[PDB]
Structures are given as C-alpha cells and as structure tokens.
Amino acid sequence: ATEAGLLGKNIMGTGFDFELFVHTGAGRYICGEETALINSLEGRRANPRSKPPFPATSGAWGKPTCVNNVETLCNVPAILANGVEWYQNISKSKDAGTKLMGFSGRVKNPGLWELPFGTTAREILEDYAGGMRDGLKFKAWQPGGAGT
Amino acid sequence: ATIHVDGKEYEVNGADNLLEACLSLGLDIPYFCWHPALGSVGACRQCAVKQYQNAEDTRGRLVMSCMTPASDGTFISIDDEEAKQFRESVVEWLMTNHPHDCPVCEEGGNCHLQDMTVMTGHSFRRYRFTKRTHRNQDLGPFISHEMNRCIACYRCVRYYKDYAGGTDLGVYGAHDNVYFGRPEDGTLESEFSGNLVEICPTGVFTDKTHSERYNRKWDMQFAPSICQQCSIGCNISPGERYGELRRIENRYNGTVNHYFLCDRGRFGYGYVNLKDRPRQPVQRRGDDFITLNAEQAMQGAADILRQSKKVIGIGSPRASVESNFALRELVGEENFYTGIAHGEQERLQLALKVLREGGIYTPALREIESYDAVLVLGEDVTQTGARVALAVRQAVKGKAREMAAAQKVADWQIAAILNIGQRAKHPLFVTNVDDTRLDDIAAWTYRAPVEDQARLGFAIAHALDNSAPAVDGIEPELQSKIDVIVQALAGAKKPLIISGTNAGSLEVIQAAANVAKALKGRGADVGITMIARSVNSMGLGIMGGGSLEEALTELETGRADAVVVLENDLHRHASATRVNAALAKAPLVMVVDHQRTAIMENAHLVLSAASFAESDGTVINNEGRAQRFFQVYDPAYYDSKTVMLESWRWLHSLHSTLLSREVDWTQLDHVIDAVVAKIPELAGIKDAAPDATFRIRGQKLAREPHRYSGRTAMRANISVHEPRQPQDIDTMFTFSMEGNNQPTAHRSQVPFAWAPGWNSPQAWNKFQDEVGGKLRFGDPGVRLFETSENGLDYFTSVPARFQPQDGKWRIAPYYHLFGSDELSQRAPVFQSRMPQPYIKLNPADAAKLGVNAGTRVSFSYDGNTVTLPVEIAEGLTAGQVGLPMGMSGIAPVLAGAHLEDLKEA
Amino acid sequence: AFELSAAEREAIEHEMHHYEDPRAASIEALKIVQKQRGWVPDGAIHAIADVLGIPASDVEGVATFYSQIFRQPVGRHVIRYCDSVVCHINGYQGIQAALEKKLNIKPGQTTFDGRFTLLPTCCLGNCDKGPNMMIDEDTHAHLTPEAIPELLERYK
Ligand SMILES: Cc1cc2nc3c(=O)[nH]c(=O)nc-3n(C[C@H](O)[C@H](O)[C@H](O)COP(=O)(O)O)c2cc1C
Ligand code: SF4
Ligand code: SF4
Ligand code: SF4
Ligand code: FES
Ligand code: FES
Ligand SMILES: [Ca+2]
C-alpha cells in the first residue's frame, strides 16, 4: 500500500499524511487492555491506567489516541463504501451490522462465520458448527470467550 | 465543597480527593498506596468507601476514596457494612502471603500494615495454603531489604523514581510475584534512599544502622531537634535508648523538610555514639591527664584565665547560637573570632548581605517546589544541600503539573499528570566544575572553573538588564546558550537563583545576586537561595567576629596567651602546621568540644561539651530561620560520673567563675534573653520555641511514649534502686512519659508522632491541619529577617576568564554527601559509603603528566606532601585538579587554592 | 562481559526511529537481542539501557514483566503448548504427557542436551483447531499424542 500510494505522504492527492507501523508484542494478556496497550506501546510495563482521563484526550505519549479492535476497523471500509442505509439494513436488531461469531470445542465443525446480530446461538451451534460430536451431550457454553 | 460522611455534613476542599479530605477531618480510612507527597494511584484498593448518587440513594457503589474528588454535594459512607467488609477483605488478601515475622521485624510497633490490619478488624485467618517467598538483596550499608514483607503497594518505586528521581530501584515481574528492588545487588545510589524506610508501609526497607542496635518505637526517648549535617536545617526526631542515640526519624515540618530527609542527615548520626568522646573534664599536668568534676575544672580554668593578659575565643559554625554567644561574652566581643577562614567568612557575609539586604525574598525549602525556572550557580546542591536538590526536582516537575491542570486533571491524579507532561519540564540550568547529580533533569549544565561560572552569571545578568556590568570575550556558542538561559529566565513567572559559599568564589555569589537583581528589575517574582556550609553558619555570620587567621596571628605574635576553642578542630579552616605551631605557642589552650579532635593533644584543658543529642540550643538556617533543638537524653543517667554539659553552660559558668569566683549553671532562657538583648539582629530566636514554663493545660511535653518499658530494670545492673527522673530546667519537655503529646495540643514542637491506632510515620496526619499541609498550630521556627524594602547595587567586579598557568593547578572542589561533612564522616557507618580518596584530573593534563587512571601522584600543599591516586575526569577543564573537600587531609578551605609540584610518586 | 553486536545496535536505532520516545523501543530491543542470542543475558539489560537512554531498572522490569522475553537461558527450540480452556477441552493434557515422556523434563525445564525447552503458554488464538503447540516460530494445530515423537524429530 505504501508503494501503491495508499500510505505515506499525500495520499490520493488529499495532502493527508499517515504512517502505519506493526508493533509485535511480547506475550501478556493484559496488553490487550487499551490503557495497558498504550503503556506497552510506550515501552513500559503494561499496567493499565485509571479513566478519566480517557485515551481520547490523554492517551499515547499524552497525545489524543483512539484504540479500536481489528474487527471494528475491518467494518469501517464497508460502511464508507456502501453507505449508512446498507449498514443499518442488513440486520433487524439494535446492534447494526454483522459480527464474526462461531462455536468451538468438541463440536462437529468448529470454526468461524460472519453472521448478522440477532442470530440465535442454537442455530449457530446446530447449522454452522454442526452440533456436538458423536456421543457427547451439551451441558454448558460460554458466549464470548474465557471472561464470560 | 460540601460532603456528607455517614450523614454528617462537612466542609472540605473540592480540589482534594476524598481520602485526604476525610483524613483531614479526623475520620479513619485505611490506606496503603496513597501518600500525601506522592499522590493517588489506586493500586492497593484499601481505601474503599461507599458513594451514593444523592441523599435518597440506598444501594450506593464502592468507590476508592483516594481516586474520588471531594466535590460538592458528595455522599459517602465509611462505616457501611459492605465497605467495611471489602476493606477487611483487602487486608486479608494482603495477609495471605505475609510472613510470620513481626517479632523479628524492625518495623514492628511502627508498622503501617500492622496498624491497618488492626484497624480493619482482621484477626482471624481462614487461609490454609502456602505463602509466596522471595530472596532478599543487598542494598548497601544503610537500607536492609526483606521482600517477603512486601504488599505490592508501589510506594517505593513511586517515591524513588517519580519523586526522588533515582534510577536504580524498580518493580520486576508479574501477577503475584512482583519484586521491588534493584536490578542487581549493590548500594542504592540516590542521596534520598533513606526515606524508603518511612515511605514503605511494611518492613521491606528498614534502617540497617538502627537494626544494628535495634529497639522498638515505644522504647525510644524522642526529642524534636534540628539536623546538624548541613545548613538546610531539616527537622528531625532523634531517639535514644540505654544512653546511646539510636535513630533519626523525620520530624514533619510543613515549611522545611516535610516528609523527607537526605541520607547524610538520616544516617550520619553515629558520631554521637563514639566511645572516644570526651565524657569528663580533663586537665593536662605535665604528661598526666587528671580527670576533674565540673566545679574544680571551672575553678582551675578561671584561675588560669584570670592570671593571663588576653584571652581569645574561637567559635565554630557547628556550635549553637547560645554557645557562640557564651564564648563571646566570656572572652569579650573584640576578642571573639569566628572559627572559619577569612575567605570563607567573606563569602558567608556576602551571602548574608544578599539574603537580608538584597530585597529579594528567600524561599523556604518547601516553597522552592513552586518556582518556574531554576538557575544553580557554582553550588553542588545535591552534595551540599541535598534537600534543596529534591525541592528543585519537584519545581522542575511543576511544568507537567501546569500542563495537567490545563486539561482539568486533578492535582492528586499523579499518573495522569505524568502521562500528560511526558518529558516536558521547567528549565533548570546548573553550573559546576564537573558533572552533578541534577544533570538528568537539567536543561543545561555548564562545566567550567568558578571564574567562568561567575562570568556566565554576570553575562546572564547583563543580557537580562543592560545596567548590569557587561562581560567581554563571550564565545558565540556560549553566547547562544546564555541567550537560551535568558529566554527561559525572562519568561518564567517565578524564577529562582540558587548559589552558595561552597563553590569557593565570591564572584559566583555576586553573579547570582546580579541575576536575581536583574530579574527583580523586570518585575519577576524572583527568589534567591544561598547554601551555607554548616548547621549554624548563618548564625555565626550574623554574630560576626574575626577570622581564624586573625586569631592565629594573635596567638603567634604573643598578644594572646590564652585561647578557648569552641567545637572547632581548626584544621578544616586553616593549615594544620600553622594551627599546631600557634596552639603550641600559647600557655593555655582550652577546648570545649564533644568530639575527640586532633587539637586536644596540645590542649591544657578539655571541657567535655555536649552534642546536639545531649544539649539544647538554637541554630540558624541557610534561609535565616531560627530553630530550637532540644536535648534528647541525660548523659549522666546511666554513667553517673559523666560530666557532659552544654557548651553555653560551661562557658557561662566559666565567665561567672572568672567574674565573681562562683560557678553558675544557668538556664537556657537566660542565655537566650542575653542574646536577644545584646545582639538585636538575633532577637528572633526568642520566638523560635516557647520557654521552659510552657505547659499544655499544666503539664510538660513528653519526650518518650506513654508505653515506655523497662522503667525499673533499665538501670538495675548498675543499682537496683531506681534513680530520680532527670530534671529538665531548660526546656518545656520532661525526661519521662509524664507529659503531653496529644495531636490536638496547642504547640508546634512535636517530639514524635503517635496516635491511638496509628503507630507508623502515618501518624503525622493527626498532627497536621490538613494532610500534607503544615502542623496544626503552625510549623516551628521563625525567620530572623524579612525581605528588605530596597535592594543592593550591581556588583561590578567581573572576573577575567580562567587561564591555566604552568606549574600551578587550581583546586576544583568536589563535594560528597558522605564525606565532606566532618561529624558525619566520623560516624563509623559512613566509611563503607565513603568514596575512596581520588584526585580528579583532565585527560589532557594526565596525559601531559604521563599519568593514567589509578596511579598515585604526590603533591605538596603548605609544605606538606601527600599522595593520592588519580581518577580521570572528562568534564573537568585543563589546568584544574579535582580534590574531595572535607576528607582526610583535604580541608574545605583549599577550594580555589593553587597546587604545586603535581608529579607521579 | 556483554557487548552488543553492530547489527543489534543498528536494528535498535532503526526501531527507535519509529517512536516519539526512545523508551518505546525497549520491548523490540529486548526481542532483537533475544532473537540474536536465544535469551536476554544480564549485561544485555545494561547495554539496551545505555542505547535507549532509560534506566536499567525499567529495562529489567520490562524484561521480567513479559513472558516471551526469556531472562534465563533456554534450549535451541522452545516448545510452547497451549494451556487454555479450549485446548483443555480438546485435551492438551495428553499432549503435555506425551511431551514430558518424550523429553523427560517438566514444563519450564530444558533437556540435558539443550535441544528443547518445554513451556506452557496462554491461548494461541487457534482454538477451533486445538490442541495447539508452538515450536520456535511454527504453530502446529490438530495435535494428537501419537504425532509428538514425529513432530519433534524435525527440530534438530
Ligand atoms: C483485561 C482486558 C484485556 C483485553 N484484551 C483485549 C484484546 O486483547 N483485544 C481487544 O481488542 N480488546 C481487548 N480488551 C478490550 C479493550 O479494553 C477495548 O475495549 C478494545 O480493545 C477496543 O475497543 P473497541 O471494542 O471499540 O474496538 C481487553 C479488555 C480487558 C479489560
Ligand atoms: S511488615 Fe509489619 S505486619 Fe509484616 S512482619 Fe513486619 S511488623 Fe509484621
Ligand atoms: S517494598 Fe514497601 S513500598 Fe514497595 S511496594 Fe512493597 S510494601 Fe509498598
Ligand atoms: S539536607 Fe542537610 S539539614 Fe537536611 S537532612 Fe540532609 S544534611 Fe541534614
Ligand atoms: S490508598 Fe486508595 S487505593 Fe490505595
Ligand atoms: S485455547 Fe488453545 S489455542 Fe486458544
Ligand atoms: Ca538541658
């Protein structure tokens, strides 16, 4: 993208300068916490920070900072290339847009599928994950990771 | 702002957090990670209160009172059952890994964790699993390390790194194996590492020097005293047990030294406990040393003084105001000589003239932390006035404070402040003959000889105001850096100019006065600070008198045939050969001193004076603040034959025995009234502390805690019969626990902090009007002089630049916090921390000499050839040779002298 | 005792170009030294601190805070088997038993020949293909306890 003129100085003739870097971490779960992400980006121990102040006003090196997930920024270009009305007219739920959902652990088809919000967990588990494996009975589930 | 705590309405400061506001109201909230000087971080999670949305809210929410602003209409509950349960739970979680160590822990009885465990009500253990353990580190001679007792409250790293600016202490590791210490074994490098023993709320960091001779806090006899190890006059609580000085605790003073000392004043008390001190008057008769009691010593000394023609008195800046005045009265005003050299005295009286006639307000030590720009001229502040260096560091962090206040971030939210002000800091410009310890935060450092530092100061003054004398021969790059300094100083709202007499140059002080006068002419709120050398240097300067050279001239010419030397070893202010010859010429030498000095071999009478622990008196700050120090203990309580009186008591009785042939052991307030009657510029010392008739509702102030042990056994091995309690006619304090030490008592002299439920140094919160403020009824001490209405003139004696001339070597003074002071370097724990005697040389000069690093060179000064090993100093300038002042064989009077015959041995 | 190589110093300085504060390159500098030497030795902390202009206390605290910055010597290959909940459900304990019985070491230990260092790690982000392992740079998914003695023979 830098060689193709999509990054660096004067992108698309607009005059906007944007430099993108990739910073590979050194293995701590707490580094995903956004204030602790900022602290780890500054080269410190990734202890979190109290809020307020939020990173929007005092974030990375004191400057304003916006921390967003990978999937949110992956959602952004479709919003800006197809419009607002398309994004609110793909799911009849209070949560607009689509989400990468998926069931894991001793199901027939463990994986990941992009589904609209409002999809029930039963139809994910039975149609996309295929239900549980042979000779296993479903006793529990966690909806959104180890912290739920 | 208005807050409602448990239904009770309180009026507080809305700019405070709820923890400091509620502690100021006498409410008890347990806390670990918060400090009044370090701010709030929210680590320990101990200070939980329950906040409600309004008056008609019942469910509430647990908030952390140190991270919650005390805004208007706030509703909190401390004594809510859920808040109490959670605070007990936090104490319990800390207790899960804590070692069973209290009987063998130096913090016991003084432990903030012990206090908060008791306060939360947690005494039942239901944890059955193992405790984590840690290996300890060796942190040097002063601090003992025990990581098992740590509760991971992060106070040590916050203090040592964010506050004291030290770089070798950190936190290592993760989840529950966090380790607070150095990256490897070795001595802690910061000059303020001693305050970790009071910052740490557990026994992880403890006083190793006290651990050698440990006694619990309830067993101490405490007194409010002044530190004697430099001119800053930090308030201390020395505490004794079994007749020896045991510990120096910090004594809170919201105006001077609030929570912190330096390592010299905290750990160099050990000269008091030396076994070779004079404990009895000794008269030399032939080769015999006859021990006398007080009466016959006074009679013999008075007879010898009466048969002599002229008696001269040589004082000291070590001795109190009362002692120096008593010597001045005994020998006469015209016969009284200050014990310092002529050049030292000239620099001292110039510093005094700038302070009390220059029309620029000299700040207190606490107020230094509010200045917007700092210029340090010639003075190695970290090695001579270290608490001024710490206050300078806080003033430098003031810029991040202002930036965070611009974004509506509260003043206690220290992590947000340090994040907003990343590396931005207020301008600091230091000058020295080499590198200093303030170079890490200095915007610029100038390594130059004292003439060139003075010329830089004069040029800064000329660029700020053209009426100041101009400096010719300024290089274009030095002129550019001078313009940088001028732009930083001119734009500051509150500039501060720091200098002192330790640089060894009159012109450095003149340049600092010129910069301050130029800044005052532009209307700036400029302050000036002067660092004197000894504890009572400004008091001896205000008293005045001839130099030591004049006294030696009188002794050598035979015009004086009797010399009384008060608390002076005479070798740190003059050459030893001249002093020895002059004292050997006199037919009477009488040394009134508390330390075995080298001039006692020639002395015909030695009066065993008392040190600051065994005496009362007044000392004057470097800022001109009169401060009383009170006696800690009676030296004769355990050894009945010890005749160790106050110096002024000895000299007043000697004067009375010379006049009316009878001994008169006077009282301290009589001597103070004599001072304020005869010397009108010292009239402020009367109000430094109240008289011996001061009572709190009829009772004296207690020196020892109310649970003092061993009353009928501490002297039983000497005699089973209990002696009389020692009588203190001099002060308002009693040598017992039959007295008052209430935090709500109307006094300002607090011997030690203790409240029921607060046995730690956190007990000081009860003795203060607001936490981190002043003492409840004002700080002790009184300024002698106000800011003058009219200023000085510009000093026009601009020196020429340093010319390195062949054969001569200009002695550049290097100061060390451990070694430059006399009494503290006599203390046996300092020899481990002392630097080796190293003579500093430029690479060019050492290459010219054919000398590398480490080889020993011999040089002759005043007919005395001494040999020292060479250390290469890149920051030094050629033609200069570096010497450590105050060490063995190197008097501080050598600062600015020249050297001859510097050749390899 | 320790001397940084020229390539290490150039990589550290080029990392320092990317950040507003040179302290922000501390993790990458530690990873550069670790990639060059297998682990970060004791003198490397002071060398990195001198290059970056920050105290060695903060570099040591960063090195001991992060689990993938090895402050003790490791083997030539670092096996990292996933510990977390989905690999627990899929049976990482059989994989751990197979690794221990083949290498004759506990987790956190190195074999006598210095060939392997066994380490448990957190989730590897490969939970639908568990149980998961990570030898030095390669992720191996769909593990079975019978595939371990064959999979450890392609790491000499
Ligand atoms: C302990 C902890 C760990 C977290 N780890 C991550 C993470 O690894 N990745 C992530 O995107 N968010 C993580 N978060 C959530 C972030 O704080 C933040 O909500 C998110 O990264 C960005 O917000 P967004 O959802 O609008 O994109 C974590 C939060 C906590 C409390
Ligand atoms: S730190 Fe306090 S609670 Fe812990 S062992 Fe020492 S005295 Fe006891
Ligand atoms: S060593 Fe002391 S001050 Fe430091 S975190 Fe531990 S308990 Fe707190
Ligand atoms: S700064 Fe000076 S007065 Fe204060 S503790 Fe240190 S030596 Fe004593
Ligand atoms: S004192 Fe408030 S959380 Fe530590
Ligand atoms: S649980 Fe093992 S890869 Fe996620
Ligand atoms: Ca007394």
Q: How far apart are CA B365 and CA B118, in angstroms?
A: 36
Q: What is the DSSP letter of B761?
A: G
Put the strands of the sheet holding B617-620 in their side by side order.
Answer: B617-620, B625-629, B782-783
B297-B303-B305 Cα angle (round to 5): 100
Closest CA to B378 of B403, B351, B417, B340: B351
Closest CA to A63 of B717, B529, B419, B104: B419
Q: Which residue has the tokens 């050749």?
A: B903
Q: How far apart are CA B638 and CA B493, in angstroms?
A: 57
Q: What are the structure tokens assigned to B480, written together?
A: 């550019």
Q: What is the dihedral of CA A42, A45, A49, A53, to 10 degrees?
A: -20
Q: What are the structure tokens assigned to B384, written together?
A: 């001579």
Q: How far apart are CA B171 and CA B33, in angstroms?
A: 14
Q: How far is CA B560 from the centre of its chain?
A: 37
Q: What is the dihedral of CA A95, A100, A106, A107, to 10 degrees?
A: 80
Q: Is C62 in contact with A45 (Cβ distance < 8 A)?
A: yes
Pairing type for strands B288-291 and B311-314 reads unpaired
Sign of the torsion angle spanned by Cα atoms B645, B646, B651, B657: negative
Q: What are the structure tokens assigned to B187, written together?
A: 């001595």
Kindly state whether residues C56 and C86 are assigned to the same domain. Answer: no
Q: How far apart are CA C156 and CA C77, in angstroms?
A: 9
Which residue type sits at B491? G
- State the nearest Cα–Cα gap between C14 and chain A, in angstroms: 13
* 8 A C-beta contact, residue C109 and residue C117: yes
* 8 A C-beta contact, residue B593 and residue B278: yes
B204 Cβ below 6 A of ligand 3: yes
B44 Cβ below 6 A of ligand 5: yes
One-letter-per-residue 3-state SS of C79-136: EEEECCHHHHHCCHHHHHHHHHHHHCCCCCCECCCCCEEEEEECCCCCHHHCCCEECC
Give kind and range of the element (H or E) at residue B479: helix B476-491
Kindly state whether residues C43 and C103 are assigned to the same domain. Answer: no
B339-B607-B325 Cα angle (round to 5): 45
Q: How far apart are CA A26 and CA C62, in angstroms?
A: 10
B226-B674-B648 Cα angle (round to 5): 50
What determination technique applies here?
Answer: cryo-EM
Cα separation values, B815 from B382, B456, B793, B871, Å: 9, 22, 31, 15
Looking at the DSSP bridge assignments, the partners of residue B605 are: B283, B590
Q: Which residues of B touch C58 (CB under 8 A)?
A: 170
- Between helices B450-464 and B506-521, what is the axis angle to 10°? 10
Instruction: Establish if A8 touches chain C: CB-CB under 8 angstroms.
Output: no
Q: How far apart are CA A115 and CA A99, in angstroms?
A: 6
Which residue type sits at B36? P
Looking at the DSSP bridge assignments, the partners of residue B291 are: B282
| B476: three-class secondary structure by DSSP | helix
Closest CA to B247 of B231, B275, B225, B280: B225
Kindly state whether residues C57 and C115 are assigned to the same domain. Answer: no
Q: What is the DSSP letter of B766?
A: G
**Helix residue ranges per DSSP H, A8-110:** 34-41, 70-82, 84-88
Which residue type sits at B649? R
Cis bond upstream, residue C120 (ω within 30): no
B553-B558-B562 Cα angle (round to 5): 90
Kindly state whether residues C55 and C11 are assigned to the same domain. Answer: yes
Q: What is the dihedral of CA C4, C7, C9, C12, to 10 degrees?
A: -130
Cβ partners under 8 Å of residue B23, min gap 6 = B29, B765, B771
* 8 A C-beta contact, residue B594 and residue B278: yes
Q: How far apart are CA B263 and CA B14, in angstroms?
A: 36
CA of B684 to the centre of ligand 7 (A): 21
CATH code at C29?
A: 1.10.10.1590
Q: What is the DSSP letter of B163?
A: I
Kindly state whether residues C96 and C134 are assigned to the same domain. Answer: yes
Residue C106 lies in a domain: yes
The domain containing residue C122 runs over which residues? 77-152
CATH code at C81?
A: 3.40.30.10
Closest CA to A41 of A54, A32, A52: A32
B112 Cβ below 6 A of ligand 5: no
Instruction: Establish if A92 touches chain C: CB-CB under 8 angstroms.
Output: no
Q: Which residues of C touch B168 (CB under 8 A)?
A: 55-57
Q: What are the structure tokens assigned to B514, written together?
A: 């010129």
Cα separation values, B459 from A127, B325, B471, Å: 85, 41, 6
Q: Which residue has the tokens 């040389």?
A: B841
Instruction: Establish if B521 touches chain A: CB-CB under 8 angstroms.
Output: no
Q: In whole angstroms, how large is the CA radius of gyration of chain C?
A: 18
**Helix residue ranges per DSSP H, B663-767:** 668-678
- State the nearest Cα–Cα gap between A32 and chain B, in angstroms: 16
* 8 A C-beta contact, residue C74 and residue C115: no
Q: How far apart are CA B761 and CA B194, in angstroms?
A: 14
B44 Cβ below 6 A of ligand 3: no
Cα separation values, B75 from B45, B61, B69, Å: 20, 11, 12
Closest CA to B785 of B675, B558, B623: B623
Cβ partners under 8 Å of residue B570, min gap 6 = B314, B339, B548, B579, B583, B599
Q: How far apart are CA C100 and CA B319, in angstroms?
A: 75
Pairing type for strands B170-172 and B8-11 reads unpaired
The ligand that comes nearest to the alpha carbon of residue B22 is: 5
Q: How far apart are CA B90 and CA B126, in angstroms?
A: 14
How many of the other CB atoms lie within 10 Å of CB of B14? 15
Q: How far apart are CA B836 and CA B840, in angstroms?
A: 12
- Between helices C6-16 and C26-37, what is the axis angle to 10°? 160
Q: How far apart are CA C126 and CA C82, in angstroms?
A: 10
Kindly state whether residues C47 and C90 are assigned to the same domain. Answer: no
Count of positions (residues) in chain A: 148
| B220: three-class secondary structure by DSSP | coil
Kindly state whether residues C113 and C133 are assigned to the same domain. Answer: yes
Which residue type sits at B700? K
- State the nearest Cα–Cα gap between B667 and chain C, in angstroms: 55
B261 Cβ below 6 A of ligand 4: yes
* 8 A C-beta contact, residue C72 and residue C34: no
Nearest to A104 among C23, C54, C127 (CB): C127
Kindly state whether residues C144 and C96 are assigned to the same domain. Answer: yes
* 8 A C-beta contact, residue B785 and residue B353: no
Q: How far is CA B265 from the centre of its chain?
A: 5
Q: Which residue has the tokens 């019942």?
A: B58
CA atoms within 13 A on the CB side of B715: 14
Q: What are the structure tokens assigned to B128, written together?
A: 């059955």
Q: What is the DSSP letter of B291?
A: E
Q: How far apart are CA B375 and CA B442, in angstroms?
A: 10
Q: How far apart are CA B423 and CA B400, in angstroms?
A: 8
Which residue type sits at B280? Q
Kindly state whether residues C61 and C95 are assigned to the same domain. Answer: no
Q: How far apart are CA B671 and CA B321, in angstroms?
A: 10
Q: What is the dihedral of CA C39, C45, C46, C51, to 10 degrees?
A: 90
Across B362-487, where does the E strand assignment appear?
373-376, 428-432, 444-447
* 8 A C-beta contact, residue B563 and residue B589: yes
Q: How far apart are CA B186 and CA B324, in angstroms?
A: 43
Phi, psi for B48 (deg, rounded to 5): -65, 130
CA of B179 to the centre of ligand 6 (A): 30
Instruction: Establish if C61 touches chain B: CB-CB under 8 angstroms.
Output: yes
- Between helices B321-331 and B647-659, what is the axis angle to 10°? 20
* 8 A C-beta contact, residue B380 and residue B501: no
Nearest to B183 among C21, C56, C67 (CB): C56
B152 Cβ below 6 A of ligand 3: yes
* 8 A C-beta contact, residue B319 and residue B312: no
* 8 A C-beta contact, residue B413 and residue B291: no
Closest CA to B512 of B495, B535, B494: B495
- Between helices B548-557 and B576-585, what is the axis angle to 10°? 40
User: What are B51-58's contacts with CB under 8 Å, separation 24+?
Assistant: B51/B75, B51/B76, B52/B76, B52/B77, B55/B4
Nearest to B167 among C21, C57, C67 (CB): C57
Q: What are the structure tokens assigned to B227, written together?
A: 């530190």
The domain containing residue A106 runs over which residues? 98-148
* 8 A C-beta contact, residue B585 and residue B555: yes
* 8 A C-beta contact, residue A33 and residue A45: no
Q: Which residues of A touch B416 (CB under 8 A)?
A: 49-50, 53, 58
Kindly state whether residues C57 and C82 are assigned to the same domain. Answer: no
Across A4-142, where does the E strand assignment appear?
8-11, 16-18, 98-101, 113-116
Sign of the torsion angle spanned by Cα atoms A96, A100, A102, A105: negative
Domain count, chain C: 2
Cis bond upstream, residue A52 (ω within 30): yes
Residue C72 lies in a domain: no
Closest CA to B381 of B496, B493, B548, B228: B496
* 8 A C-beta contact, residue A142 and residue A136: no
**Helix residue ranges per DSSP H, C1-108:** 6-16, 26-37, 42-52, 56-65, 85-89, 92-103
Q: What is the dihedral of CA A129, A130, A136, A142, to 10 degrees?
A: 30
Looking at the DSSP bridge assignments, the partners of residue B496 are: B374, B527
Q: How far apart are CA B160 and CA B406, in angstroms?
A: 27
Instruction: Establish if C1 touches chain B: CB-CB under 8 angstroms.
Output: no
Looking at the DSSP bridge assignments, the partners of residue C140 are: C133
Kindly state whether residues C83 and C144 are assigned to the same domain. Answer: yes
Q: In whole angstroms, how large is the CA radius of gyration of chain A?
A: 20
Among A49, A51, A54, A63, the residue to mutate for chain B (most B Cβ within 10 A): A49
CATH code at A133?
A: 3.10.20.600
**Helix residue ranges per DSSP H, B278-375:** 294-306, 321-331, 342-357
Those residues whose beta carbon sits under 5 angstroms from the ion ligand 7 are B 616, 631, 730
Q: How far apart are CA C131 and CA C141, in angstroms?
A: 6
Q: How far apart are CA B280 and CA B289, in angstroms?
A: 11
Index of the ligand 3 atom closest to the CA of residue B151: 7
Kindly state whether residues C81 and C60 are assigned to the same domain. Answer: no
Pairing type for strands C77-82 and C133-134 reads antiparallel
The residues of C whose Cβ lies within 8 A of any Cβ of A are 18-21, 23-28, 30-31, 54, 58, 61-62, 65-69, 84-86, 89-90, 121-123, 127-130
Q: In whole angstroms, how large is the CA radius of gyration of chain B?
A: 28
* 8 A C-beta contact, residue B449 and residue B801: no
* 8 A C-beta contact, residue B834 and residue B825: yes
* 8 A C-beta contact, residue B606 and residue B647: no
Residue C71 lies in a domain: no
Q: How far apart are CA C130 and CA C137, in angstroms?
A: 17
